[PDB]
Design a protein around this ligand. Structure first.
Ligand SMILES: *c1c(C)c(O)c2ccccc2c1O
Ligand SMILES: *c1c(C)c(O)c2ccccc2c1O
Lengths: 100, 99
């Protein structure tokens, strides 16, 4: 509980990760990504995007299912843990806006 | 609304910081003397406690107050921003607990 939180923070602390599960929760229409726009533009290399998605996946936030190689089509759908984490996020997100 | 959250989390990702914040939330007037914290957190070296407190200070989450009740007191208080944060953390605690 202690180092789970400290670690989750630390993940959240790193840059994309916070923004990514915003998308997964919000921009999704069926709680899956399918790499759409392979992200919406933004300042980020998919070298480092790919890195972050991996981090999410390792922390069971996200799961990936390769639908079809023959061409390769990849989802990136969010888990319960992830969904929940996004749900827990909302108050600190709100707070962040008050102080900025 | 963005990397302020990233920045905040980054601080929270640090070794004692989240705990210190939680402690203070749970302390009366959201305020603890240095040595209260030091014993209460078992394992923190007071080098560290200071360093951490400075960080959260710099962040504007904690205020250090010198009370000139001289025999002295030094207290660390949670700022409205800090207190508000602590509140904000609670769903995340809950989440972690569930897993
Ligand atoms: C460890 C523990 C045991 C608790 O209770 C919290 C609460 C809030 C933020 C961070 C914590 C850590 O790291
Ligand atoms: C930046 C933005 C714009 C948003 O929406 C979130 C949401 C949740 C965690 C972190 C975020 C960051 O850093």
């Amino acid at each position: 509980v202690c180092p789970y939180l400290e670690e989750t923070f630390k993940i959240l602390g790193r840059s994309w990760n916070g923004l990514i599960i915003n998308y997964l929760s919000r921009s999704n229409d069926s709680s899956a990504h399918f790499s759409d726009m392979k992200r919406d533009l933004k300042t980020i290399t998919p070298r480092a995007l790919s890195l972050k998605l991996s981090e999410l996946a390792q922390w069971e936030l996200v799961e990936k299912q390769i639908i079809s190689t023959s061409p390769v089509q990849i989802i990136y759908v969010l888990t319960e843990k992830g969904k929940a984490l996004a749900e827990a996020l909302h108050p600190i997100e709100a707070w962040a806006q008050s102080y900025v």
